[PDB]
Amino acid sequence: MNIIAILNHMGVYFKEEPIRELHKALEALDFQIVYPNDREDLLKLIDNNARLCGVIFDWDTYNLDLCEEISAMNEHLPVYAFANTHSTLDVSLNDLRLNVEFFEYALGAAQDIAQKIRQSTDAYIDEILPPLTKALFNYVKEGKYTFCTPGHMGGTAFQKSPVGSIFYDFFGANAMKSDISISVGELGSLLDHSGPHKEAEEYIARTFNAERSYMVTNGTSTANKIVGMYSAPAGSTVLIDRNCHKSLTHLMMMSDITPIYFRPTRNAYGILGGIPKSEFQHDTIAERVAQTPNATWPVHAVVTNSTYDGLLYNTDYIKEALDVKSIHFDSAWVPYTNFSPIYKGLCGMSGGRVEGKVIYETQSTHKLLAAFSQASMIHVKGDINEETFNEAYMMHTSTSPHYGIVASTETAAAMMKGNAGKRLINGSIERAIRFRKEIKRLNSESEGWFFDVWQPEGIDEAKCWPLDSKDNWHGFKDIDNDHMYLDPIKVTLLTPGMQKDGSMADTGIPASIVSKYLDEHGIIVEKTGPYNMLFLFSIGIDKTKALSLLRALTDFKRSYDLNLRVKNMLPSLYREDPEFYENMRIQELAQGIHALIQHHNLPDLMYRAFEVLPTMVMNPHAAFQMELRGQTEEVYLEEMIGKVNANMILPYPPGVPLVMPGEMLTEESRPVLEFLQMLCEIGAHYPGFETDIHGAYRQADGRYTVKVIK
Amino acid sequence: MNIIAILNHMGVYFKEEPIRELHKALEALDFQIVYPNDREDLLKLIDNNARLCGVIFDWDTYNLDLCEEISAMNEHLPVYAFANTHSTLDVSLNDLRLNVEFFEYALGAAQDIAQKIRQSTDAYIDEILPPLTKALFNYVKEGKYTFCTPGHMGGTAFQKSPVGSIFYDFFGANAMKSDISISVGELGSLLDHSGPHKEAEEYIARTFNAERSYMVTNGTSTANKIVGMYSAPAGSTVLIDRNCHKSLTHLMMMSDITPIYFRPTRNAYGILGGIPKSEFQHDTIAERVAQTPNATWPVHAVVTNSTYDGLLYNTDYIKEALDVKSIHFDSAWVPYTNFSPIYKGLCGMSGGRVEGKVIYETQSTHKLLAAFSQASMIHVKGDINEETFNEAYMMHTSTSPHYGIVASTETAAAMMKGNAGKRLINGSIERAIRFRKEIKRLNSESEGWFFDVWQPEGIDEAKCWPLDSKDNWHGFKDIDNDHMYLDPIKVTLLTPGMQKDGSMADTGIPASIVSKYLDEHGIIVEKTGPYNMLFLFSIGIDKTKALSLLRALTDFKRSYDLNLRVKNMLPSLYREDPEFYENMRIQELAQGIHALIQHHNLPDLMYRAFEVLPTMVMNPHAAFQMELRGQTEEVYLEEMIGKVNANMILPYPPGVPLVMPGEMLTEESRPVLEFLQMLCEIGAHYPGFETDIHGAYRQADGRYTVKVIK
Amino acid sequence: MNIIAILNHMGVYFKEEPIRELHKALEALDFQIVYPNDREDLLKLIDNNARLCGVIFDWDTYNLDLCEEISAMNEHLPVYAFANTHSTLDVSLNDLRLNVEFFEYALGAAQDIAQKIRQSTDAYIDEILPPLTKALFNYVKEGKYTFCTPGHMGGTAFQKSPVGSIFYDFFGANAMKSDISISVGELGSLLDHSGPHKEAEEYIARTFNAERSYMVTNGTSTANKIVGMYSAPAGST
Ligand SMILES: Cc1ncc(COP(=O)(O)O)c(/C=N/N[C@H](CCCCN)C(=O)O)c1O
Ligand SMILES: Cc1ncc(COP(=O)(O)O)c(/C=N/N[C@H](CCCCN)C(=O)O)c1O
Numbered sequence A, B: 001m002n003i004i005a006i007l008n009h010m011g012v013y014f015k016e017e018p019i020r021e022l023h024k025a026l027e028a029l030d031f032q033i034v035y036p037n038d039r040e041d042l043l044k045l046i047d048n049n050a051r052l053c054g055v056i057f058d059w060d061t062y063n064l065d066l067c068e069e070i071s072a073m074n075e076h077l078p079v080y081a082f083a084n085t086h087s088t089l090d091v092s093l094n095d096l097r098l099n100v101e102f103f104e105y106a107l108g109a110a111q112d113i114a115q116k117i118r119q120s121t122d123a124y125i126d127e128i129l130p131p132l133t134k135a136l137f138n139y140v141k142e143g144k145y146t147f148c149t150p151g152h153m154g155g156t157a158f159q160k161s162p163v164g165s166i167f168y169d170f171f172g173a174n175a176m177k178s179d180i181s182i183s184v185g186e187l188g189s190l191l192d193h194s195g196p197h198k199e200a201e202e203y204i205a206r207t208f209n210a211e212r213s214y215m216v217t218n219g220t221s222t223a224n225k226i227v228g229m230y231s232a233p234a235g236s237t238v239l240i241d242r243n244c245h246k247s248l249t250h251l252m253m254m255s256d257i258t259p260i261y262f263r264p265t266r267n268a269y270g271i272l273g274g275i276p277k278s279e280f281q282h283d284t285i286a287e288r289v290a291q292t293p294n295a296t297w298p299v300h301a302v303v304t305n306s307t308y309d310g311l312l313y314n315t316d317y318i319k320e321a322l323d324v325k326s327i328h329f330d331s332a333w334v335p336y337t338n339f340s341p342i343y344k345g346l347c348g349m350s351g352g353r354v355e356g357k358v359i360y361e362t363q364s365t366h367k368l369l370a371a372f373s374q375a376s377m378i379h380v381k382g383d384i385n386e387e388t389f390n391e392a393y394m395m396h397t398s399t400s401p402h403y404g405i406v407a408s409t410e411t412a413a414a415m416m417k418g419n420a421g422k423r424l425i426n427g428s429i430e431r432a433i434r435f436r437k438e439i440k441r442l443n444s445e446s447e448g449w450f451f452d453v454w455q456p457e458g459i460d461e462a463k464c465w466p467l468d469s470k471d472n473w474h475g476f477k478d479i480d481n482d483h484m485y486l487d488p489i490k491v492t493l494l495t496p497g498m499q500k501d502g503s504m505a506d507t508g509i510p511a512s513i514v515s516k517y518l519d520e521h522g523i524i525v526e527k528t529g530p531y532n533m534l535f536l537f538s539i540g541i542d543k544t545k546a547l548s549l550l551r552a553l554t555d556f557k558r559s560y561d562l563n564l565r566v567k568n569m570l571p572s573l574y575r576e577d578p579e580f581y582e583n584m585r586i587q588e589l590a591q592g593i594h595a596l597i598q599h600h601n602l603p604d605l606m607y608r609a610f611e612v613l614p615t616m617v618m619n620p621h622a623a624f625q626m627e628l629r630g631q632t633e634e635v636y637l638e639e640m641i642g643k644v645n646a647n648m649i650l651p652y653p654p655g656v657p658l659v660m661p662g663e664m665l666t667e668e669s670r671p672v673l674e675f676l677q678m679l680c681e682i683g684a685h686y687p688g689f690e691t692d693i694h695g696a697y698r699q700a701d702g703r704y705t706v707k708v709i710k
Numbered sequence C: 001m002n003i004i005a006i007l008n009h010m011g012v013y014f015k016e017e018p019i020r021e022l023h024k025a026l027e028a029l030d031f032q033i034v035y036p037n038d039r040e041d042l043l044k045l046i047d048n049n050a051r052l053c054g055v056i057f058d059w060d061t062y063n064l065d066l067c068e069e070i071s072a073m074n075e076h077l078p079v080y081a082f083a084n085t086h087s088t089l090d091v092s093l094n095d096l097r098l099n100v101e102f103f104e105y106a107l108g109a110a111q112d113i114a115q116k117i118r119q120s121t122d123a124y125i126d127e128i129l130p131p132l133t134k135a136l137f138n139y140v141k142e143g144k145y146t147f148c149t150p151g152h153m154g155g156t157a158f159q160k161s162p163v164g165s166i167f168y169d170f171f172g173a174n175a176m177k178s179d180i181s182i183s184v185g186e187l188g189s190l191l192d193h194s195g196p197h198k199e200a201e202e203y204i205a206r207t208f209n210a211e212r213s214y215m216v217t218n219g220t221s222t223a224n225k226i227v228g229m230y231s232a233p234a235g236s237t
């Protein structure tokens, strides 16, 4: 934050000489001087380099509208205008609102002006920094000696060891000096909500449209556990999205609560759909309560918004129709809502208080914003017991929080403020839309197969595209209108292999092969389905990465059409089993995997298996408790009918839980067993594509076992 | 790790010129060349700089015993010997065991030798690095493009923002690039225990003398909860150290487990003593089970070893005598055991398998070793159900672990390997002992008051000093012999105010004032008691910090004797309340606090309050569940007698839980109430010394309230 | 107050190279480094140059009695001892009374030691400065814009005039920037005996063995008139 831009190269000594003296004086204050050639050059320089901390220009040459253009991108960016002919009568109120400091041309005045510019730079840094992060930076500047934990003592222990010195050099001195504990009392305490930490929370609460905000250092898994534990005492009933993360299952296995599951939809690709509106109706909930033993009217409800693939709910309807006092939205995938108007009414915090209800949002700051991993936010709108919620929060938060993660959470809040943050979010949205349009365009010019994007046909402007019943791009059957919206940030690319009606095509390219190819060429997809790939076009994706992705996809298509050897096209896959892939070509491998999927009819089997709910003999807490007591045995896959499952069965695809602890497979739920057996059979044919079923254990004979209650 | 030391100043061109050529060629490979003046200079240089990666010396001038001296400090540090007169007949087997590579003198041979030295440096780095950290570093060197979480995409989003650019510049590019998720499949999965992660675990298990090892990214709080949840099913009885961390209390509030509390001792200073051997006897436990309602024979037992003040147990006796199938040692404060012989038999992992028992150790790697905060280890010795334990582990571990914390854990394991790690631990122990001896010496030669050190009178050699019933330095009454030992690392300094018999002196200086003075002068103590101050002499403490501490203590004594103004001595304290501290001098403030402590008789009241156990109406789980249901009201301090506490009451001092959730104060436990009232009265007299009682809430009127069940 | 004396010419790399690095890091912080040839040279240099703000020496070569000799001339002058063989057991209470800060020899540790020495230099300057003078210097460092008397506004009016510019160059910028009035409320008021002014009086009273002290800006003529007028009412002898 030490780059100062000086405009103009005028030809009068009485201006150039003071500017050269000021250049020397600023360099004496550790500033880096850059010289844009014109106004447009300066604007581009500001737009591309966030470390530009100041602009110096001649007022005689440029009017104060240049400051308006500068403030359109960064309203806090200090501007220094040198006045020669204009006086105090040449400035208006609107101009006086801009962040301009006025200086004059004079020999020998460079030291004072350089000091003024230094003070202005410090003030700008102070203004844009959030409170807790600024306090942490100041503490690191202090350089105090610690005799407390962590114990590496600001990295000294690492510097005393060779391997530790490598670690120190990799992570740097500042990452070690900022690693502190509550023994440093000037920083306050995360658990006590005191000092800068306290202000941090309020800062966050104002940035994310929340009444109360809590910082979590063990991810949205821990955030979900905290919210669920405060909301649902032992013996209560909770509505749970079936498309819930495994953390909700862990919470259920932790606390004795009775679950009643919302039933979401899906398509042929295996993309999880939204919960139909009827499932939020009071009569449906009452019927499920009556049909569920030891179940009363639910006191908490958890909905996944959005889904992994980017399907957001109209949350106003849910907040109005869900007759539950506590509504929690697992928004791990959408922390950027409230920073763009396209998400209005599509998130838990949207709007104001709900009478007689409390609304929670759990957000993975580290997922779609800029924050270190495990950084999570809990946002509360409504009435809570602050003491009791603080107890539930302390039971899951460590007494030695990582200050880097907490500061990253606060800095993520800070990065969303002002014109710079608005431009960040809007630019990411526009980049994703441009990539989607380019994928469609390339598909049009392509002669033969090419990747498609799972989206509406004619996307034009920046918005969350609604999923209507008339259209068939989304693949959902009889969908509710004004219910589900597609997030433009989450870009799903489709590989060939499925038809418009949901059936399989004669040929197809499993998306896992494309994922491996991208990995070999330095591109990491977020996740891969049977014929879909998810790419996150977050604030961290630039034009370079999008163009590289396009080039890699085109190169894959060219290589596949040429039918190259798997040895050369996928070197890592060949290294997995050189004998099996010695002479195989990419087309033969892709067609073999597609033929396995088609002959076993994976899409229909997966859909049928996930549209029938296994019967709940006991809640997950009871099954886990009897598992901890040793009352469990390992049986084979085919013998699981009539057995109470002890663990969660989470297969890939589709990547969501199919069987919950305390659930039993019957003749009605036999599709679950045959889908699992199909997955086990398919995963044993190609050495680089194994069966991935959490909760199932592969034996030496290749058979798969599950753990069930005796 | 690019510093090469050349020990050579010969006066022959046929050696000098090839060495100069080698210097230029090594500099071309980005090596920093240093020139020690002699053998002793080279040895000191190696001892003081862990970034030295190679030694080049002339074999004619120096025999191979110099390599022996080098390997005494670093057995992997490559040595390059230039042979002129010696041949293959001049090397013995013992010399051949040393890591020495032989070269020859020749013009024009510098490039090949420099390449060989580069390969040797890379081999050295590879040899000392642990596997998972090496994989992380290699992945960062790859520089791939991510379309997955975290979403800052290696820090790109940070570089696109001004405040984010400040954050990026502070933490550095490598910290942000190493932040990844399981979408990068080559690094494996911590949750799945696959790939390099798996190797890391095995590596850790071999370094810490554990059968199995698990890495926790949410601290020893989460590690304790995982161990307890696996070991204690709902409805089971657990033996719990009363000197337990709040995490064990949180686990009891989470799971319906019935606790039976061990009773540790304490001294006049409030230092928590060890649990007497009688509490571990089968008859005592059986009697407690008979008296405790809804209690069976305990299936789990948790012991805090060591204590906060550094008291380790003879763990062999506990393992032999404690008739519990599951014994868990909360060793958050002692992760360096197994790395020094003085701790033999003083930790859970010491020795081998206990027949019919499982032993757990929970270590805060980030507390006394070199690791990032929240890094913890679970060490298991004995038979466990790996699948059930893995489920319990997943229930508390986030699906997006901080890879930096995981790598810091592995690097902490690697830092203990070899002669360098042995020298690190031994140097820390010897530094702590030298500081203790210096404190004793300064006390002996001081005229008047001086800081004391809680230790035996005649500490000479490096060992854990036993606490004998004959000596009275430790202040414990009728202690068992060969039971408790003092860890030399944990240095407790005593300020005047107490007497040798346990009563308080006429005058005294509370340790909080000394703590504030040290904070003002850049020294952070671990924690402060009424008259004691704890300092951690970890591997991160050097001679510089120890001498700085001594200087600061002498400065405090001088300033206090001069009776300076509080305005000048403690500027922050005066800034808290300028009107109250306007004319106060340090002696008056210290004497006022000491007079309050004496008049209220804090030591005797605290001892009595922690000597009587409050009666357990219900276990903490029941109280917390009924608190989550709104069945809790708020009463004042004087009205808690006969009420069931809803939350744990943790007073400071002594910093350990006094009242647990579900416990009720009676006439037998009225000293608890008197002690709490005394603390509330004492904390309202000086604006910088407030009452610190977790679970008690100060109101506007100044009175303190606690909440109980209605 | 930026002259640091470094005292040794040892013949070992593991000490010489860190000292050279510290020399570079101290020059980066605007310090002037001097190299006395021996102990007596250093003592004479300290005696003859009050602008010496620090002494760096090797603890192996010189015991802490050299710090005693230095403190005999200036008890607040910071000394920096580099410890190699001596440990915490080699220092006594009397030595611990001296204003010595201890460092170690290590490559790459120069920036931290330079920052520590800078903080020590600032503390030394603060300790020797009186309160009101310190406040005036700090205010001048703030560089505020005044719309109040004196009216030259920190010397701007002098810089706007040729003869005024000669006057300004002669008297210097700090003299004109420190010439302020009570409109700057943070400096307090001499007439009201408030703020740093009040502290100044107390400071003066302690230094001159007086119960009360008053500052006069019009000489002992005015001081005598004040004392006499308070002491001698009209009509007295
Ligand atoms: C809806 C929802 N709610 C909560 C959480 C827990 O949040 P976390 O602890 O991870 O911060 C997640 C986490 N999903 N990601 C993990 C894998 C890590 C990311 C790999 N690129 C998974 O797929 O299991 C979630 O999807
Ligand atoms: C016996 C025992 N067992 C487990 C834990 C949890 O380990 P953690 O989650 O913190 O890694 C702790 C934690 N003690 N330290 C914390 C914070 C200290 C910060 C200043 N140095 C506290 O005082 O409450 C413990 O003392």
Ligand SMILES: Cc1ncc(COP(=O)(O)O)c(/C=N/N[C@H](CCCCN)C(=O)O)c1O
Pocket: C218, C219, C220, C221, C222, C224
């Ligand atoms: C006993 C006594 N009491 C008070 C004062 C007034 O003090 P002042 O206003 O000057 O600060 C003076 C002043 N004497 N100085 C002048 C000579 C000027 C300096 C020549 N080098 C004189 O002799 O006339 C004094 O001698």
